[PDB]
Structures are given as structure tokens and as C-alpha cells.
Design a protein around this ligand. Structure first.
Ligand SMILES: *[C@@H]1O[C@H](CO)[C@@H](O[C@@H]2O[C@H](CO)[C@@H](O[C@@H]3O[C@H](CO[C@H]4O[C@H](CO)[C@@H](O)[C@H](O)[C@@H]4O)[C@@H](O)[C@H](O[C@H]4O[C@H](CO)[C@@H](O)[C@H](O)[C@@H]4O)[C@@H]3O)[C@H](O)[C@H]2NC(C)=O)[C@H](O)[C@H]1NC(C)=O
Ligand SMILES: *[C@@H]1O[C@H](CO)[C@@H](O[C@@H]2O[C@H](CO)[C@@H](O[C@@H]3O[C@H](CO)[C@@H](O)[C@H](O)[C@@H]3O)[C@H](O)[C@H]2NC(C)=O)[C@H](O)[C@H]1NC(C)=O
Ligand SMILES: *[C@@H]1O[C@H](CO)[C@@H](O[C@@H]2O[C@H](CO)[C@@H](O)[C@H](O)[C@H]2NC(C)=O)[C@H](O)[C@H]1NC(C)=O
Ligand SMILES: *[C@@H]1O[C@H](CO)[C@@H](O[C@@H]2O[C@H](CO)[C@@H](O)[C@H](O)[C@H]2NC(C)=O)[C@H](O)[C@H]1NC(C)=O
Ligand SMILES: *[C@@H]1O[C@H](CO)[C@@H](O)[C@H](O)[C@H]1NC(C)=O
Ligand SMILES: *[C@@H]1O[C@H](CO)[C@@H](O)[C@H](O)[C@H]1NC(C)=O
Lengths: 596, 49
């Protein structure tokens, strides 16, 4: 008779009404994603259109039942989730125009044409090609040519559209009750109605800057070391003191510094830990490694998954007779259906990614009891930290030796630990400044503190200082340097990777504290304790039922993100690097202008 | 799935109507603040156990 009962009835009808349509759309998408053909595209399009129409109709219907009338907090969360997604508060000739802009941006990103040094025969694409060239090619001229050409292609082509796109997005943000697009994106990390656990949208920036200022010294020491390594690798191009060339380091965008391991390996005379050679001796296959990962998951104290997963999985290349996009995904179709789509080639990285995907599958299985609107997990950093901690705790020499792939003779030495820690740090800590700088620049652009005529210079000014790299070729307001990235042109938030790392390490430490294990936590072997499994499972089966602060307190005992576990993990590398830089200055000089 | 007066033991009620969840008269089409009972099931061979 009251408002609360009406809301409860509406929600309990809505869940059962929407489950079928969501299942149909997901099944159509999965069917397309392995048997690519035009009819599958049409099926996906019509199913998604029906799902979107139903969602928008339900969102329009749910406008009643004012939120201050409803007292139950879960009903408030469900109503807010229903009201937010599917909202279309915008005038005509703008929504369709925005959709056209977005799909044109996606198409132009998916089709890049450099066409070699004026060679009509071949026009390289972002498939194995120019990116593969930047992966491994010791040639300054070729790297510089590709580096400038790619941005010249996706520069003035995409530069004018970004201004009107951000203008329209800010107009939409003004239309609904918000501040701007930056505030709209930051609103995900929000808690209200609960004391001691309420988290606003203003403390996130303060926490991020505090964590970055705490992180800085280790990153700057690693930067000095890699500068010296590049200096004895690349002669006459690296300034004694200053920044680094952008195109030389790592990948195309410099996000991951993984490809510098060979040029920066310290005392790497000893054989690598990788066990991809021994796999052929036992004639391993995808089924074997997936079963081993399932056995590890069971030994942790968690159930193994249903026979339907084994029946409907796609854990092998279908062959030339089928058209399938090969990329590891973990689909949860609903109604008790879970399946992984991934090709395997019997290699160590495949062995790690099997565990990485199985972690997500188990997390999806865990929270399948909450209502539909709260089935998705907590703050989006959790869903990657839970999948990354298990990959972290599965590549240790102890676990490999226990499994049997490692020979029971390779003892551990200081140099092997140093090599492993540097290999980890080349990808774990390297991306933090890049993500921080990109997200900060996007936030300033969204807020409007940077005038349009001041673009393309303050961005590089941030690059010359925060990260410590310098453009090799001067750039003006005709190019859009932060536009060649996949996520910029596809309208995806980027802070999810800054909070992914910290959280993850925290979890690991807490888990490695549940199972009594001495020594450095960088070699932890959580594979037999049942207390750690209970600690993880007591938080896994929650979804969006409690604020993420409460879950964080449940798992580790803290109240917010902290950076101490990461430095605890990387302390030996910090000490060795400090002992190594006995004759090299640490820092950079922004005044250096090699391009002149 | 939507009916008051929980069934007494061993009784069957084949009576499709329009649920009056709300405070307004409701005749024919449910529409807003009004629902229809007897939701379906759905069944596929790939459904989970
Ligand atoms: C309410 O509305 C919001 C926004 O509209 C929805 O938020 C979306 O949530 C989904 C679910 O996480 C997000 O999907 C994620 O996309 C990431 C980006 O991947 C893109 O790029 C890759 C290539 O690199 C493509 O293959 C891919 O198709 C995407 O185009 C993925 O990386 C994420 O995958 C993660 O999990 C899987 C396991 O499932 C891992 O295997 C992956 O490695 C990865 O860790 C994920 O798929 C989506 O981006 C969100 N939208 C936005 C705008 O951010 C809400 O879901 C919605 N609420 C509902 C529907 O209830
Ligand atoms: C806000 O609304 C939700 C939804 O109704 C409330 O959660 C509900 O809590 C009751 C218990 O108070 C649950 O009842 C349970 O039913 C099972 C049926 O087998 C029974 O075995 C249990 O012993 C219990 O009686 C009910 O299931 C649960 N609803 C859902 C969807 O899980 C919640 O309590 C409300 N908030 C507050 C503060 O009360
Ligand atoms: C891939 O898609 C094609 C095209 O739909 C499928 O071929 C159809 O298969 C069904 C039976 O499942 C037949 O009724 C159709 O006549 C077929 N059409 C054509 C054009 O061949 C094919 O079976 C799919 N392969 C899968 C799902 O593995
Ligand atoms: C976790 O449990 C597994 C299963 O008992 C242990 O694996 C055994 O290790 C011993 C030592 O070499 C072998 O003799 C057994 O054959 C292994 N069992 C199986 C089923 O292969 C593993 O050592 C345990 N890990 C820890 C850290 O206690
Ligand atoms: C995991 O699979 C094995 C083999 O089928 C089975 O014996 C075991 O009970 C399974 N684990 C759980 C928790 O059901
Ligand atoms: C590591 O151990 C080796 C001997 O195993 C020792 O010589 C060295 O001083 C230690 N410390 C390092 C390499 O920083």
C-alpha cells in the first residue's frame, strides 16, 4: 500500500522480465564472436536494439517513487542503478549526431593508413605491423618515421571532432543533475546514507595525488636506471641529464615498458624461469593446463565449475574453416551459463592467462545470488584485482616446482630474484605515471580549466615533467597527441588501472598473512590454505550490496586504498637500485630540447 | 508470483486478474501502478543446472 511495497513489486517483476532479454542478447553476441557472418551481425543488432528499447522504457517508467520516500537502502541502490543507465535526457538532432560521431571515430581508429614510405603495395594497419615494428626494431630513423606518421594520420583527421564531442558531452552533463563529465565519471566512487563509510567524489583526486607523491622516488630511480641502460644501448642520442625520447621506449604509446627487458637485463647469465620448453616433453595441451588451474582453484578451497563450461567452451583455435576473433574473454551469459573464449598455444603466458580468466569466472560465479541490478561487482577495480592476484601467486618458482614443470634442482639465488623483480616492475609500476597523467589531463579538459587554444602544449608540458619524456618532433595545434589511444576514441574511463594495482597488492598481502608464510611476500604460495579462501569468499558473494570501503575492511582491515604493500613488495629492488646508482644523477632536466 | 492471501493447504486458484498494487481503480490494461500475475518460465537446453 505504501511506496516501498510498490517499488519492491516493480523491482521483482523487472528482474524476471529483463533476465530473458539479457540472456538472448548475450547469447547472440557470443554466437557472433566465434562464427563471424553477416546474419549473426544482424541478429546481434536487432537483439541489442530490443534490449536497449526495453531498458529505456523501464527507465522512463521508473521515474516515480521519489528517493527520499524509500527508506530501504538496497531499494535505493537498485532504483539509482535503473535510473542512471539508459537515460536519454537530451534534445533532438544531438543523440543521433553523437552516435554518428562515436561510430565514425571507431571506424577511423579501426582503419589507419600509413602506406609505408610512399609504397603503394602495402598499407600497414594496427594488426602485426607498425606496432610490431615498435615492439622490436633497433633503428632510430624507422621508429621516428612510424611514430610521427601514425599521429599525422590520426591527427587533423580526429582533432576537430573532439572539440564538439566534448562540448556535447559537457552539455549532456549539465542537462542532468551533475557538474561536468569529469564529475560524472568520478561519481562511481560514491557512498551515501551510511556513516563511517561514506565516500564522496572529491576525495578521490586527493587520494590519487597522495599515492602518486608517495610512489614517486622508486619510479624516478627506475627511470634513472633505464636511462643509463638506454645510454649504453643507444649512443649519441640520449642526453646526459634530461628526459627520454618517446618513440624509443617500449610500445607505441609507452604505456608498458615490457620490451626493454633484453636491453636492461641485469646480470642475466642464468637461464630464464620460463618453462615453455618442458611443456612439449609431457605433451601438454589446453585441457591439461585448464584442468591444472581448476585443481589449483579447488585446492584453494573453492568449487570447480559446471560441465556446461567444458561443453560450450572455445579453448582451441577453430581452424581456417571458421571465422573467430581470438581474444581471451570470460562470458557470463546468465541463468547458470559461464564460458571462456580463448585460443591456446601451450606457452607459459597462456598458462598464466588461464588462471587470470578463471579468476574472473569464479568471481562471476560467486555473486550470482544477489538481484539482477546488483549482480555486477563492486568498484570496477575489484574485478581486475581479484583476477590479477591469483596470476601473481601462480608464477612463483615454488609453485612451479611443486607442480612439477620446474626441475627439482633450480635453487633460488639473489640474482634470479633481482631479475624477476625488475621484470615485474617493468610493467607494474611503469604504467602508473602514464595513467595518472592521462586521467588528469582528461579531467582538466572536461572541467574546462585548460582553454582550447591552450591544448596540445599543456599536455606535452605535463609529459615533459610528470613522466620524464620529451617529444622528438615539435607539435602544434593541428595534431591531437592523446587521440591515438584505443580508450580515448572509444569513450572509456582510464582510472580503473590506477586503482587496479594498489588494491591487488593489498589483497595479496592480506591473503599472504592469512596463510602463515615468512620471508618476502614477493614469493608467496597461497595454494593450500582454506582460511584465505574463506577470507576471499566472505567478500566475493556481495556485488553492489555494500560500499567498497566495507569490503576492503573485510578483506584487509583498512578503510581506503593504501600504497605501503607495493613498496613492501618492491623493497629488495629499491635497495639494489639504490646500491647501483652510485655514480649517476637521479632526476631529469625539462629544459633539454634535443629537437631544437 | 503476485497474489495476496497465501494459499490454504490443498487449494487451487485458476483466476487470472489484474493486480491492484497501488491506490487507484484498475480495469482492463494494467499499465502504471498495476500489474498482471502469471509470469512465464522460459526454457533452453543450454541453461545451467
Ligand atoms: C551501465 O552502463 C555502463 C556504461 O554504459 C556499463 O559499464 C560497462 O561495463 C562493462 C562490464 O565490465 C565494461 O566492459 C569492459 O570493457 C573493457 C574494455 O574492453 C574493450 O576493449 C577490448 C579490446 O581491448 C574489447 O575486446 C572489448 O570488447 C571492449 O571493447 C574490458 O577490458 C572489460 O573486460 C574485463 O573483464 C574480462 C572478463 O569478463 C577480462 O577478460 C578482460 O581482460 C577485462 O579485464 C569489460 O568487458 C564496459 O566498458 C562498461 N562501459 C563503460 C562505458 O565503461 C554497465 O555495465 C551498465 N550496467 C548494466 C548493463 O547493468
Ligand atoms: C530491503 O528489502 C530487501 C528485499 O526484501 C530485504 O531483504 C529481505 O530480507 C528478508 C529477511 O528480513 C529475507 O527473507 C528471507 O527469506 C528466506 C526465504 O527462504 C528465508 O529462508 C529467510 O529466513 C528470510 O526470512 C528476504 O529474502 C530478503 N530479500 C532478498 C531479495 O534477499 C531487506 O531486509 C530490506 N532492508 C531492511 C533494512 O530490512
Ligand atoms: C555458422 O553460421 C552459419 C550461418 O548461419 C551456420 O550455417 C547454418 O547452419 C544452420 C544449422 O545450424 C542451417 O540451418 C543453415 O542453413 C546454415 N546456413 C548456412 C548459410 O550455411 C553454421 O552452422 C554456423 N556454424 C556453427 C554455429 O558452428
Ligand atoms: C598442497 O597440496 C598438494 C596436494 O597434496 C601438494 O602436492 C603434493 O606435493 C607432494 C610433495 O612433492 C607430492 O609428493 C604429492 O604427490 C603432491 N600431490 C599431488 C596430488 O600431486 C602440495 O605440495 C601442497 N602445497 C603446500 C604448500 O603444502
Ligand atoms: C572438482 O572436480 C573433481 C573431479 O570431477 C571432483 O571430484 C571434485 O568434487 C570437484 N570439486 C568440488 C568442490 O566439487
Ligand atoms: C645476494 O647474494 C649473493 C650470494 O648469493 C651475494 O654475493 C650478494 O652480495 C647478495 N646481494 C646482492 C646481489 O645485492
Amino acid at each position: 500500500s505504501t511506496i516501498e511495497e510498490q517499488a519492491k513489486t516493480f523491482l521483482d517483476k523487472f528482474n524476471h522480465e529483463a533476465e530473458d532479454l539479457f540472456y538472448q542478447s548475450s547469447l547472440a553476441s557470443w554466437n557472433y564472436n566465434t562464427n563471424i557472418t553477416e546474419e549473426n551481425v544482424q541478429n546481434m543488432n536487432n537483439a541489442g536494439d530490443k534490449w536497449s528499447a526495453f531498458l529505456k522504457e523501464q527507465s522512463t517508467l521508473a521515474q516515480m517513487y521519489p528517493l527520499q520516500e524509500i527508506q530501504n537502502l538496497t531499494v535505493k541502490l537498485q532504483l539509482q542503478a535503473l535510473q542512471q543507465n539508459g537515460s536519454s535526457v537530451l534534445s533532438e538532432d544531438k543523440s543521433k549526431r553523437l552516435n554518428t560521431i562515436l561510430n565514425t571515430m571507431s571506424t577511423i581508429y579501426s582503419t589507419g593508413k600509413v602506406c609505408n614510405p610512399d609504397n603503394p603495395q602495402e598499407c600497414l594497419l594496427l594488426e602485426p605491423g607498425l606496432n610490431e615494428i615498435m615492439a622490436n626494431s633497433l633503428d632510430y630513423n624507422e621508429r621516428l618515421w612510424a611514430w610521427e606518421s601514425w599521429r599525422s594520420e590520426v591527427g587533423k583527421q580526429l582533432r576537430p571532432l573532439y572539440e564538439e564531442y566534448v562540448v556535447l558531452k559537457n552539455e549532456m552533463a549539465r542537462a542532468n543533475h551533475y557538474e561536468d563529465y569529469g564529475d560524472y565519471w568520478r561519481g562511481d566512487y560514491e557512498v551515501n546514507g551510511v556513516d563511517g563509510y561514506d565516500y564522496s567524489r572529491g576525495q578521490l583526486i586527493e587520494d590519487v595525488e597522495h599515492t602518486f607523491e608517495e610512489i614517486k622516488p622508486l619510479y624516478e630511480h627506475l627511470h634513472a636506471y633505464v636511462r643509463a641502460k638506454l645510454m649504453n644501448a643507444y649512443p649519441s642520442y640520449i642526453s646526459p641529464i634530461g628526459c627520454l625520447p618517446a618513440h624509443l621506449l617500449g610500445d607505441m604509446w609507452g604505456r608498458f615498458w615490457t620490451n626493454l627487458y633484453s636491453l636492461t637485463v641485469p646480470f642475466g647469465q642464468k637461464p630464464n624461469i620460463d618453462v615453455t620448453d618442458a611443456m612439449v616433453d609431457q605433451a601438454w595441451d589446453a585441457q591439461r593446463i585448464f584442468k591444472e588451474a581448476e585443481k589449483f582453484f579447488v585446492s584453494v578451497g573453492l568449487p570447480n565449475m559446471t560441465q556446461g563450461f567444458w561443453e560450450n567452451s572455445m579453448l582451441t583455435d577453430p581452424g581456417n574453416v571458421q571465422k573467430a576473433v581470438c581474444h581471451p574473454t570470460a562470458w557470463d551469459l546468465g541463468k547458470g551459463d559461464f564460458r571462456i573464449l580463448m585460443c591456446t598455444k601451450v606457452t607459459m603466458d597462456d598458462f598464466l592467462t588461464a588462471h587470470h580468466e578463471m579468476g574472473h569466472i569464479q568471481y562471476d560465479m560467486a555473486y550470482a545470488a544477489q538481484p539482477f541490478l546488483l549482480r555486477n561487482g563492486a568498484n570496477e577495480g575489484f574485478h581486475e584485482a581479484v583476477g590479477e592476484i591469483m596470476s601473481l601467486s601462480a608464477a612463483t618458482p615454488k609453485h612451479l616446482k611443486s607442480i612439477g614443470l620446474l626441475s627439482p634442482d633450480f635453487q633460488e639465488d639473489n640474482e634470479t630474484e633481482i631479475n624477476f623483480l625488475l621484470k615485474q616492475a617493468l610493467t607494474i609500476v611503469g604504467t602508473l605515471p602514464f595513467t595518472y597523467m592521462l586521467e588528469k589531463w582528461r579531467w582538466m579538459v572536461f572541467k574546462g580549466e585548460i582553454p582550447k587554444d591552450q591544448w596540445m602544449k599543456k599536455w606535452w608540458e605535463m609529459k615533459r615533467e610528470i613522466v620524464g619524456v620529451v617529444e622528438p618532433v615539435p607539435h602544434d595545434e593541428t595534431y591531437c597527441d592523446p587521440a591515438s589511444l584505443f580508450h580515448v576514441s572509444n569513450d572509456y574511463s582510464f582510472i580503473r588501472y590506477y586503482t587496479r594495482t594498489l588494491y591487488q597488492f593489498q589483497f595479496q598481502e592480506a591473503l599472504c598473512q592469512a596463510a602463515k608464510h615468512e620471508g618476502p611476500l614477493h614469493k608467496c604460495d597461497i595454494s593450500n590454505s582454506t582460511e584465505a579462501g574463506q577470507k576471499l569468499f566472505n567478500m566475493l558473494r556481495l556485488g553492489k550490496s555494500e560500499p567498497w570501503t566495507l569490503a576492503l575492511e573485510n578483506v584487509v582491515g583498512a578503510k581506503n586504498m593504501n600504497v605501503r604493500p607495493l613498496l613492501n613488495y618492491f623493497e629488495p629492488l629499491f635497495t639494489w637500485l639504490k646500491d647501483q646508482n652510485k655514480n649517476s644523477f637521479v632526476g631529469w632536466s625539462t629544459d633539454w630540447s634535443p629537437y631544437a | 508470483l503476485l497474489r495476496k492471501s497465501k494459499l490454504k493447504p490443498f487449494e487451487r486458484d485458476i483466476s487470472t486478474e489484474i493486480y491492484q498494487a497501488g491506490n487507484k481503480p484498475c480495469n482492463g490494461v494494467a499499465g502504471p501502478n498495476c500489474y498482471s500475475p502469471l509470469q512465464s518460465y522460459g526454457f533452453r537446453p543450454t541453461y545451467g543446472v
